[PDB]
Amino acid sequence: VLSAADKGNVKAAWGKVGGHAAEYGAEALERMFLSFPTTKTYFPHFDLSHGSAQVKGHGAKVAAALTKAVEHLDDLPGALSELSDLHAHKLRVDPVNFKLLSHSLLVTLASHLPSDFTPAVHASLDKFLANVSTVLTSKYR
Amino acid sequence: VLSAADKGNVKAAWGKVGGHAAEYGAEALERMFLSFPTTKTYFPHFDLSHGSAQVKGHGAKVAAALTKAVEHLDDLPGALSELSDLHAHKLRVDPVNFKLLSHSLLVTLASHLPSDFTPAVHASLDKFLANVSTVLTSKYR
Amino acid sequence: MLTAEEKAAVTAFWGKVKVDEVGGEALGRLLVVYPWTQRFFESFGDLSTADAVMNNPKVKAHGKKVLDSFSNGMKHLDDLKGTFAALSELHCDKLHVDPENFKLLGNVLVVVLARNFGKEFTPVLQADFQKVVAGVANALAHRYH
Amino acid sequence: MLTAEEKAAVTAFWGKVKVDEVGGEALGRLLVVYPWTQRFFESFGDLSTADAVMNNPKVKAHGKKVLDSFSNGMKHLDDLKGTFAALSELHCDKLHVDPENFKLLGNVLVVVLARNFGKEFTPVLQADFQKVVAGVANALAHRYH
Numbered sequence: 096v097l098s099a100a101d102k103g104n105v106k107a108a109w110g111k112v113g114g115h116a117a118e119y120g121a122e123a124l125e126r127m128f129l130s131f132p133t134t135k136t137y138f139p140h141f142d143l144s145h146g147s148a149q150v151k152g153h154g155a156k157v158a159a160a161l162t163k164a165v166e167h168l169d170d171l172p173g174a175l176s177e178l179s180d181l182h183a184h185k186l187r188v189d190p191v192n193f194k195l196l197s198h199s200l201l202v203t204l205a206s207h208l209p210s211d212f213t214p215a216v217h218a219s220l221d222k223f224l225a226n227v228s229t230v231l232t233s234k235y236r
Numbered sequence: 237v238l239s240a241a242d243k244g245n246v247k248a249a250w251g252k253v254g255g256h257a258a259e260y261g262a263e264a265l266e267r268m269f270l271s272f273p274t275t276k277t278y279f280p281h282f283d284l285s286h287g288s289a290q291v292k293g294h295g296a297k298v299a300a301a302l303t304k305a306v307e308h309l310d311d312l313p314g315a316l317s318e319l320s321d322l323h324a325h326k327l328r329v330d331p332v333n334f335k336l337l338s339h340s341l342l343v344t345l346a347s348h349l350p351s352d353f354t355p356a357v358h359a360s361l362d363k364f365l366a367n368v369s370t371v372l373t374s375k376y377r
Numbered sequence: 378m379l380t381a382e383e384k385a386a387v388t389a390f391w392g393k394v395k396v397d398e399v400g401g402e403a404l405g406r407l408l409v410v411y412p413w414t415q416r417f418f419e420s421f422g423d424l425s426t427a428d429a430v431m432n433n434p435k436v437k438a439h440g441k442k443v444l445d446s447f448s449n450g451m452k453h454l455d456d457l458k459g460t461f462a463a464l465s466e467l468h469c470d471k472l473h474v475d476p477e478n479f480k481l482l483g484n485v486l487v488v489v490l491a492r493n494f495g496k497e498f499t500p501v502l503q504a505d506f507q508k509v510v511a512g513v514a515n516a517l518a519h520r521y522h
Numbered sequence: 523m524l525t526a527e528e529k530a531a532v533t534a535f536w537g538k539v540k541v542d543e544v545g546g547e548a549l550g551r552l553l554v555v556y557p558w559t560q561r562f563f564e565s566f567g568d569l570s571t572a573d574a575v576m577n578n579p580k581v582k583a584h585g586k587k588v589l590d591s592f593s594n595g596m597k598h599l600d601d602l603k604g605t606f607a608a609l610s611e612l613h614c615d616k617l618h619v620d621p622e623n624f625k626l627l628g629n630v631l632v633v634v635l636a637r638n639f640g641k642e643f644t645p646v647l648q649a650d651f652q653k654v655v656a657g658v659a660n661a662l663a664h665r666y667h
């Protein structure tokens with residue numbers, strides 16, 4: 096459950112990501128693939144080489160979805176309904192993988208915004224991502 | 237999200253448990269403690285030997301809670317509000333443990349109701365227990 | 378990971394399992410309880426309902442196949458890694474099977490053993506199998522890269 | 523666990539870590555992001571707000587302690603089990619710490635290193651540390667019963 100405080104923290108931190116969102120997206124993914132190789136089983140037809148256009152392109156879509164999430168913090172389920180449907184009915188990505196991407200994103204953000212990634216913002220992002228994860232797998236069964 | 241069909245299955249299966257609920261709860265606990273020894277870190281002041289009074293007493297309370305949940309399937313959050321506050325603010329049991337007790341309980345139901353534990357009931361029970369787990373950990377942060 | 382005693386207890390119990398029947402049930406329950414697992418068995422046909430899945434002749438055939446392999450593992454409790462190394466590789470490189478699935482199936486299989494053996498599938502027995510299932514899932518996931 | 527080049531990389535990077543700082547930071551963040559972990563440090567005093575936790579002198583001291591112990595492991599990447607055998611035993615029998623906590627701290631540790639080293643904490647470097655924190659968590663979980 097996102098508190099009022101959490102919502103301000105997420106809006107603020109995401110505000111600082113700004114134009115770099117797509118880039119951080121591509122980097123979180125790349126970090127995910129290296130630290131947790133089992134995640135690669137969902138991208139069998141991807142060129143996963145460092146710098147691939149495919150990973151950059153995917154990184155940008157993930158980032159845009161998150162941006163949309165940040166804008167509708169009071170209606171995550173409505174804002175991400177199409178994506179829940181997609182993950183639930185087509186992609187069928189095992190729920191554990193969401194924690195691996197969340198962590199990778201957290202790692203990315205921390206390295207890029209050292210000064211803004213305070214304990215409180217860290218806690219709020221962690222909760223936001225968990226809530227995004229939950230929404231995305233809510234239609235699985 | 238429990239469908240109409242899910243609710244029916246849960247109510248029907250809990251119905252067959254009937255009076256053995258207290259008994260099954262204590263067995264689930266025991267199965268959980270042998271299988272996943274780390275769960276014992278939450279009961280240091282308990283006598284965890286086979287048939288301990290403490291374990292039977294606790295299993296009965298657990299089961300009683302589940303029985304309550306089954307009667308209020310349409311409002312788990314209200315039905316479980318105080319156990320939510322208790323797990324979150326006092327016990328502070330790490331969320332993974334809920335998955336372990338859940339599994340332990342399913343194995344218990346399976347072994348005692350071979351004919352009623354159909355694949356579809358299995359699936360509705362798994363979902364119900366997950367839902368219960370989610371409600372018990374909803375106020376953790 | 379298992380003691381000589383646990384091995385002995387597990388080996389002795391394993392010799393009562395009707396591998397074909399249990400195998401089809403385990404795979405079937407996995408597709409019903411965790412429907413996203415259906416992603417790898419599109420070619421099997423109709424998986425729309427609990428009934429379609431349970432009676433599906435391919436699910437059943439595949440269930441047996443997996444369980445025979447499992448049984449093979451039971452004969453090599455001392456080297457699960459060596460026994461499943463090639464299968465590990467195959468599941469990674471050709472099948473692209475998320476190792477997490479191995480964990481789900483191990484758990485469904487312990488539930489199926491319980492349902493089939495009732496009171497004979499004791500708390501201690503179950504604990505031993507929990508270890509087995511875990512060691513197998515781990516041997517199968519060990520060559521992912 | 524890692525290769526000789528990976529071992530060399532992690533070793534070299536670790537030599538740059540300000541252990542008291544990173545320690546207090548990691549422990550402090552753990553108590554804030556996963557507040558239920560607070561259950562073991564009630565005696566530490568006020569842990570009600572982020573600030574209270576982060577400025578708490580005992581969280582600070584303890585963070586230092588844990589990381590000095592972790593550093594010891596960095597010197598024995600080959601025998602983590604032997605290294606933390608006595609501490610595993612202690613965490614289980616005397617402190618009653620769910621080993622799940624060890625994974626949580628390992629993950630927070632990685633985020634702290636990334637915050638503190640920025641761009642220097644490369645995706646490759648992170649991968650190496652993930653293997654280490656997992657190795658340490660497993661070593662500490664090892665004597666549980």
Ligand code: HEM
Binds near residue numbers: 160
């Ligand atoms: C925060 C969590 C996530 C978000 C916001 C997210 C969002 C998205 C979006 C926006 C798309 C593209 C839809 C389109 O084609 O228009 C997508 C596709 C996809 N996602 Fe997710 N995703 C998340 C987590 C995951 C995880 C954890 C995995 C697997 C580890 C995953 C695997 C995939 C795959 C395989 C595709 C399809 C890619 C292709 O083949 O083109 N996603 N996701």
Ligand code: HEM
Binds near residue numbers: 275372
């Ligand atoms: C379906 C999941 C669960 C339900 C419905 C449940 C319910 C309860 C209930 C009704 C009580 C007793 C309240 C009282 O008498 O004061 C309780 C206490 C407790 N629960 Fe939970 N619980 C669940 C899961 C867990 C798990 C997974 C653990 C840890 C492995 C756990 C650990 C405890 C402990 C340590 C106590 C206090 C025992 C004592 O000292 O008397 N619970 N729970």
Ligand code: HEM
Binds near residue numbers: 479513
């Ligand atoms: C955990 C125990 C498992 C074992 C021992 C096992 C073993 C096997 C074996 C022996 C084969 C056949 C290899 C061949 O000759 O082509 C196979 C194929 C396969 N397995 Fe696994 N498996 C296990 C679990 C799983 C799980 C959990 C899944 C996914 C839900 C899975 C998905 C598949 C698929 C899709 C194939 C290919 C079937 C085909 O030819 O169409 N397996 N496995």
Ligand code: HEM
Binds near residue numbers: 589591592627659
């Ligand atoms: C994962 C890396 C960890 C290492 C290397 C580590 C190491 C240590 C060491 C060296 C001590 C002092 C032992 C003594 O008093 O003889 C200690 C104590 C303790 N640790 Fe751990 N620890 C780790 C993680 C954790 C975590 C995640 C928790 C709980 C959230 C925890 C809870 C405690 C507690 C409660 C104490 C006793 C504090 C006191 O003196 O009152 N540790 N640990």
